[PDB]
Structures are given as C-alpha cells and as structure tokens.
C-alpha cells in the first residue's frame, strides 16, 4: 500500500498569509494526486484532480504541484472562507488513501474569556445527582486551562470538558466544564469554585458560588 503523509497537521495562519501543504507518497504514483476541502459538518469538496488539474468553480489562489512521490498543495492569499480541513488522496493504486488532513485556524487577536458558573439544579438533585457547570466563552487562543477545587481544596476527578470549533464569526473559542458528583458528596463540602488559566490574564481567573 502507498503511504500518503500529510503535513503540517494543523496550522494557525492569519488572513492573506500563504498556506503550504505537502504530501509524500511511499511510492511513485505519477500525477495521480488529488486534494479536498472540508468545512465543519459537510462532505469533502473536490478541489484539484489528477495532473494538478484545478477544479472548475474553484478560485485561482489554489494550486497543486508534483509528480512521483513528493506533492504540494498551495493556497496563496488565504481568505477567511478557506478555514477548513484539507486532505490529499493518491489514486493510482488500490487501496485508495488520504492524507491525515491539515486543519486551519484563523490567527486572530487575543480575547479574554467570559466565565460563568452554575450550581446544580434541584431537579437533578431530586434524581440523586449533582452537576456544577462552568462556561467560558468567546476567547482566543484555544490553549486555556480550567482547574476546579472543592471547598478551597483541589478536585479533578469526574470532570468533562467540551470545546466548540473556532466561531465562524469572531473566530474565538468557547468551552464548558461540568463537575459531576452525587448529591451526597455535593451538599456538604462548601465552596465550589471554577479556576482558569488563559494567556490574557497574569493571575488565575476565578469564578465561584457557595451552598
């Protein structure tokens, strides 16, 4: 089997900057290399076929190059409507194989998070459980850190973290933090606090309530 290798894995470039993606095949595949673009929730879209043939309807700032084993995809002036995932595909020998992809983030101004903490709802308590939530919205870059500490202590077992893709509007990230712990271990510990560490602040950004 021919091993397509993509690079870079990810790549946070900023508007207009040049975008270079390379793909190498473990064997000579001639000009049987193809490239695809795929935005969030949607099938892959065709962009460059065999022989580096740019696709019809595809903008002119997208170009492909190569023959043999070393191939290169190029986006010249990256427009904020290029922020997607890309994949290469060799096609001269079954089984067909894609690169592992290259995701693109919009390099944009820093943004501090809007933290928000919520104590568990009575309805959930009634069911025999307790979940404290903490939202952190519209920040950048994704590289953030959320720490939880029960009653001035430090707990970190039974926590969930979800991250939203980079907003298509303000290019910022958001994440939610859920702390689950039976109603028992809950109501009898006092200060539930949510702490964060983002490169926008020098000291730990906190947020908490008391039962």
């Amino acid at each position: 089997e021919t091993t397509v290798t993509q690079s870079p894995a990810s790549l946070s470039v900023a508007i207009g900057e040049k975008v270079t993606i390379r793909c190498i095949t473990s064997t000579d595949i001639d000009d049987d290399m193809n490239w695809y673009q795929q935005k969030p929730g949607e099938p892959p879209k065709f962009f460059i076929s065999e022989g580096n043939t740019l696709r019809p309807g595809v903008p002119s700032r997208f170009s492909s190059s190569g023959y043999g084993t070393d191939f290169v995809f190029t986006i010249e002036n990256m427009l904020s409507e290029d922020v997607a995932d890309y994949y290469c595909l060799q096609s001269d020998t079954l089984p067909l194989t894609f690169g592992s992809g290259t995701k693109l983030e919009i390099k944009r101004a820093d943004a501090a998070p809007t933290v928000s903490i919520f104590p568990p709802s009575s309805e959930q308590l009634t069911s025999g459980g307790a979940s404290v939530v903490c939202f952190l919205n519209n920040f950048y870059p994704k590289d953030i850190n959320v720490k939880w500490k029960i009653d001035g202590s430090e707990r970190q077992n039974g926590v969930l973290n979800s991250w939203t893709d980079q907003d298509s509007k303000d290019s910022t990230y958001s994440m939610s933090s859920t702390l689950t712990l039976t109603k028992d271990e809950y109501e009898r510990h006092n200060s539930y606090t949510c702490e964060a560490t983002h490169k926008t602040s020098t000291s730990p950004i906190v947020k908490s309530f008391n039962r």
Partner: protein, 214 residues
Amino acid sequence: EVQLVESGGDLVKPGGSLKLSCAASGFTFSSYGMSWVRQTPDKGLEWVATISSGGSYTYYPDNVKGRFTISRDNAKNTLYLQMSSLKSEDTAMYYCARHEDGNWNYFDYWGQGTTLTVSSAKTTPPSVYPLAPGSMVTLGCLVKGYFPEPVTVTWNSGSLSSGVHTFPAVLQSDLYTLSSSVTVPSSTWPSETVTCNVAHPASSTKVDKKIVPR
C-alpha cells in the same frame, strides 16, 4: 446538478448487520463507478469499497474484505453497502461517493453522509436540567445521559440565535452528555421567558425546559 443521498445509518449491536443505500441523481449512473467512504474523528477519511459501472468488478480494502459487500442497481440508480460482523471500529459516518471513471479513480461527488454506530448501549432519552444563575445574563441547559447521538438543542424554538453555544457530546459512562449556553440582555430576563428545547429523535423524545431564577 449531481446529487447523492445516503440513508440507513442506525444503532446496531456489535457483530450485527445493516444495509446502507444511496440514491444517485442528476447524472447517468450506469456510466460511473461508485463507492463508500467512512469518516471517524480519530482516523479521518478511509476508502471502504468500490464497484464498477456495470458492477462486474468490486474492490474492498483488507480490513473490510469478507464482511462488506458492495453492489448496485443501474435500473434503479441505487448503490448499496451490505455489512455484517459489525465492529466498534466500524463506527463512523459513511459517505456515498462517485468516481469520475468507469471503474475507479478519485472522488468528484459526495453525498451528505449517514452515521453508523456500533454498540451495546441502549437507546435512552436524555435528562434535561435547566441552568440558571443564583449588561446581559447567560443561561444554560444540561442534556445528560442519553444515547445515541445526535440531540438537537434550540432555544425558544429557534427564536434565539445570537450568542448560543452548544458544545459537542462526550461519552462518560457509556452515555452522551452535552450542554448549551445562551446570552441575553439582562432586561429580557426573567421578564421574558427562556426555554431550551431538546429533541432526541432516537427515542422520539423532545423536551422543553424553561429557565427560571432559582
């Protein structure tokens, strides 16, 4: 233009069987080779199988050969994917895709996808806990302990669009969990009501939880 529409994705217990199908439209189907491609979040795209125009030649990769059977109906313009001895590693979104060649080649057209989940977990409607606070306020809503994906979360039937954040699900105890936040002007609450509606088609369930000051 060309149109491909998959269907058939469902929940299936390991070692189970299922049949996926594709409705090909807008092009002379009998002239192109067809194929299935699946996509997992942890291993990207992956060619699953191909079949020729007249359907006489078929090609599958090794990690599938034997279990998967591709086929077509040129009379009806439909593509099919028979699967058996289903595995947890077969869990992915399957795409119906067209080759620009009479046999195989690259992929010019892709359907919208259909999801396949392979698990022992049973369909469970989710529990919905309203998240209220103890210039503009931010409310939440916790959708916990359901299975399988997806769950559709809207606020006020869609009336509220701006500043809505729905975070991806997370398998925790073998059941998914997700939450959603919304920001509204401090004046519009708790004067105007706010509700997150959570629909879970897998269990034909749909709840509407109103957020109120605790």
